[PDB]
Amino acid sequence: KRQVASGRAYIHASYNNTIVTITDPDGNPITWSSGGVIGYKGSRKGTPYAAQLAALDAAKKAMAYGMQSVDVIVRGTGAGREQAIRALQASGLQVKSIVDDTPVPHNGCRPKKKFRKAS
Amino acid sequence: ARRRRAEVRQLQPDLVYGDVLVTAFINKIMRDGKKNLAARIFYDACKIIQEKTGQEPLKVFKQAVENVKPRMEVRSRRVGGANYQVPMEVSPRRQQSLALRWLVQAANQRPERRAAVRIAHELMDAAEGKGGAVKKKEDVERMAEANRAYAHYRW
Amino acid sequence: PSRKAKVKATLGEFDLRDYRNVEVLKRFLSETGKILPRRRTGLSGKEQRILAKTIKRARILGLLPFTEKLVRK
RNA sequence: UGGGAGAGGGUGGUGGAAUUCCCGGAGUAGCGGUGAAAUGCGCAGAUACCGGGAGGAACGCCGAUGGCGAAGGCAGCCACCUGGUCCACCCGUGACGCUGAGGCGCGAAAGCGUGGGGAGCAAACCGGAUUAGAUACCCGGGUAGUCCACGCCCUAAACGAUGCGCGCUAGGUCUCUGGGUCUCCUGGGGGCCGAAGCUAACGCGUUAAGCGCGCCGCCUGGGGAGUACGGCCGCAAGGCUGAAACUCAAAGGAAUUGACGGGGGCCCGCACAAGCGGUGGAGCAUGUGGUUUAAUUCGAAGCAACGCGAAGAACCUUAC
Ligand SMILES: [K+]
Ligand SMILES: [K+]
Ligand SMILES: [K+]
Ligand SMILES: [K+]
Ligand SMILES: [Mg+2]
Ligand SMILES: [Mg+2]
Ligand SMILES: [Mg+2]
Ligand SMILES: [Mg+2]
Ligand SMILES: [Mg+2]
Ligand SMILES: [Mg+2]
Ligand SMILES: [Mg+2]
Ligand SMILES: [Mg+2]
Ligand SMILES: [Mg+2]
Ligand SMILES: [Mg+2]
Ligand SMILES: [Mg+2]
Ligand SMILES: [Mg+2]
Ligand SMILES: [Mg+2]
Ligand SMILES: [Mg+2]
Ligand SMILES: [Mg+2]
Ligand SMILES: [Mg+2]
Ligand SMILES: [Mg+2]
Ligand SMILES: [Mg+2]
Ligand SMILES: [Mg+2]
Ligand SMILES: [Mg+2]
Ligand SMILES: [Mg+2]
Ligand SMILES: [Mg+2]
Ligand SMILES: [Mg+2]
Ligand SMILES: [Mg+2]
Ligand SMILES: [Mg+2]
Ligand SMILES: [Mg+2]
Ligand SMILES: [Mg+2]
Ligand SMILES: [Mg+2]
Ligand SMILES: [Mg+2]
Ligand SMILES: [Mg+2]
Ligand SMILES: [Mg+2]
Ligand SMILES: [Mg+2]
Ligand SMILES: [Mg+2]
Ligand SMILES: [Mg+2]
Ligand SMILES: [Mg+2]
Ligand SMILES: [Mg+2]
Ligand SMILES: [Mg+2]
Ligand SMILES: [Mg+2]
Ligand SMILES: [Mg+2]
Ligand SMILES: [Mg+2]
Ligand SMILES: [Mg+2]
Ligand SMILES: [Mg+2]
Ligand SMILES: [Mg+2]
Ligand SMILES: [Mg+2]
Ligand SMILES: [Mg+2]
Ligand SMILES: [Mg+2]
Ligand SMILES: [Mg+2]
Ligand SMILES: [Mg+2]
Ligand SMILES: [Mg+2]
Ligand SMILES: [Mg+2]
Ligand SMILES: [Mg+2]
Ligand SMILES: [Mg+2]
Ligand SMILES: [Mg+2]
Ligand SMILES: [Mg+2]
Ligand SMILES: [Mg+2]
Ligand SMILES: [Mg+2]
């Protein structure tokens, strides 16, 4: 609708969902999808297939905006990360590159109990 | 089968089409080891197909089988409390076993009074792309993938 | 395995306390701002301990990075 | 005197990563969470993404199997103030030493007082699930507290559960830090395996749990009990000290052979799975339980009792 051509694809993988966001060359989102955006409602969202689908939903909706080439950026380490990547590559969009940018503190905040017991 | 890998036993070729695949179908038809009666039934069927069809029954038989073979199916597997229908490929060996089994089952579900008619008509509707057999095959494949979400539990 | 070559053998006579020689210091950081382990640096308990001090100093100055993005996956 | 290594301590600065919140942008319907869910958050536009700001707390990689400290403990980086300690020279004093009741000081976490500060986390607590219940485990919230300053408290599995000092008694191997004529010798630490020896074993073994001397502390069967009383200390919570009546024949340590595990690794069996045909449904036959009976003879009782003893009950048999 605005014609952007080339941009960024952000994969936010986690153990509960995969949410993809495509943005213009400088971070502003164009479209987005996720296990919830598509059918899946609960546990299924995490699954890699859902990731695959969301990834495709994202690209498809992005090509409408005239997208063609993307720069992928992966954040997260969920059960479905690597699938969204293979999804975008076969989506039609050209994967110019892949980069893992998962945030990691240099030891800041006391984690939730669920994420402790970690020496 | 905890030790070996129980090898598939070979069957004696057909006394007519000299086909092993035929003896097989005959075995499924057979009940109470009445292999004669089984044989007759199948043959009168190849005959009834010769009738309503100007094609060699052996070719119809094959085609039919082929259409009823499921190339995918769901298998249950317990993981984390609940059981999940995991779809997975279906070995050639089992496809054959499944196709023939269903043909006879579907055929005996039919309305025609005579056994031979049933196998005949089922065999035809089969090579055509219809019939209760082909449905089972389809209801199965539809079942698979309909659970593709769990395809990562390869099994 | 850790056998690509040790960063020490791959260098020449250099001052481990020179926090400005980003030219060489940089060769001690991974494909990320991360300080390489002795198995890779080829340095010693004492040498390695001084490097750290130096690197961190360069990081404060802006000459060296604290972290970088992995390029693949 | 000359040097050395160090998260040893105190003070003041300062850095980047992340979380939360706030502002702007862009974007749209879900996010989050679980075994599965719901509570919860989101069209007053959340989640995901970019930019800006605020604030508190902690310090990734290097980190080790490492280093420092009397113990408790101590991890960005920089400066200052300061403790301990190791080595070389063989220079000075001339037994000035060791231990150490009481005293004094230090003393993790939680907790207390006064005043600050609160990002994240989180006793209580408020809810959602689970469950037979679930005042729990899992999930969404959340106050004290966690952080700082001053005072307090003085406890711990404060552990090497091993008091301090000195002398003596094979060696191998890895490691940290000095010195050397830098194969490798030397000194001080940290580990492992082991001579002799020691030990109930397990194990310890120049970093003794060996062989010895010095001094301190402490034990004397279990329960009652770290309780009661008393004293001292404390704002409090409580701390230190610490019994008795009554009662038991044990309480314990190490190791052995087993059995067991919702421990691990291998591996079998119609064990499951894959199949094909059946039985719990009908009528009937037969055994049984239960009722009933003058008697319904007796035994068999999960598997491994139930068409079983009975491979022949009308009288006989049968014991009723
Ligand atoms: K909703
Ligand atoms: K012994
Ligand atoms: K008292
Ligand atoms: K024991
Ligand atoms: Mg989910
Ligand atoms: Mg220090
Ligand atoms: Mg920040
Ligand atoms: Mg905003
Ligand atoms: Mg909330
Ligand atoms: Mg709402
Ligand atoms: Mg609502
Ligand atoms: Mg609206
Ligand atoms: Mg931001
Ligand atoms: Mg604030
Ligand atoms: Mg030490
Ligand atoms: Mg300790
Ligand atoms: Mg000093
Ligand atoms: Mg002298
Ligand atoms: Mg003299
Ligand atoms: Mg003393
Ligand atoms: Mg004295
Ligand atoms: Mg204290
Ligand atoms: Mg405290
Ligand atoms: Mg307070
Ligand atoms: Mg306060
Ligand atoms: Mg919380
Ligand atoms: Mg229960
Ligand atoms: Mg309840
Ligand atoms: Mg909670
Ligand atoms: Mg300990
Ligand atoms: Mg040694
Ligand atoms: Mg030593
Ligand atoms: Mg040594
Ligand atoms: Mg011995
Ligand atoms: Mg013993
Ligand atoms: Mg022994
Ligand atoms: Mg030893
Ligand atoms: Mg000794
Ligand atoms: Mg001893
Ligand atoms: Mg003592
Ligand atoms: Mg005592
Ligand atoms: Mg007593
Ligand atoms: Mg007692
Ligand atoms: Mg007490
Ligand atoms: Mg008092
Ligand atoms: Mg008082
Ligand atoms: Mg107490
Ligand atoms: Mg007594
Ligand atoms: Mg023993
Ligand atoms: Mg035993
Ligand atoms: Mg066992
Ligand atoms: Mg077997
Ligand atoms: Mg067998
Ligand atoms: Mg079975
Ligand atoms: Mg019945
Ligand atoms: Mg009755
Ligand atoms: Mg008797
Ligand atoms: Mg009886
Ligand atoms: Mg029997
Ligand atoms: Mg009689």
Numbering used by the authors:
A (entry chain K): 1 to 119
B (entry chain G): 1 to 155
C (entry chain R): 1 to 73
Article excerpt on this structure:
The 4′,6′-O-benzylidene acetal 1 was synthesized and tested for growth inhibition activity (minimal inhibitory concentration, MIC) of bacterial cells using wild type and recombinant strains of Mycobacterium smegmatis with single point mutations in the drug-binding pocket. Similar to paromomycin, rings II, III and IV of all four derivatives maintained their interactions with residues in helix 44, showing that neither the acetal nor the ether modifications alter the fundamental binding mode to the ribosome. The synthetically added substituents of compounds 1 and 30, which result in a ring system mimicking apramycin’s bicyclic moiety, stacked perfectly with the nucleobase of G1491. Unlike all other aminoglycosides that form a pseudo basepair interaction between ring I and A1408 consisting of two hydrogen bonds, no pseudobase interaction was observed for the acetal series as a consequence of the absence of hydrogen bonding with N1 of A1408. The loss of this interaction constitutes the main structural difference between the benzylidene and benzyl compounds examined. For both the benzyl and benzylidene compounds (1, 30, 37 and 39), the 4′-O-substituent prevents hydrogen bonding with O2P of A1493. The 3D structure of the drug–ribosome interaction and the benzylidene acetal’s chemical structure resemble that of apramycin, while the IC50 values for mutant ribosomes indicate important differences. Acetal 1 induced pronounced misreading on bacterial ribosomes but little if any misreading on eukaryotic ribosomes. This unique pattern of misreading induction differentiates acetal 1 from both the parental paromomycin (misreading on both bacterial and eukaryotic ribosomes) and the comparator apramycin (no misreading on bacterial or eukaryotic ribosomes).
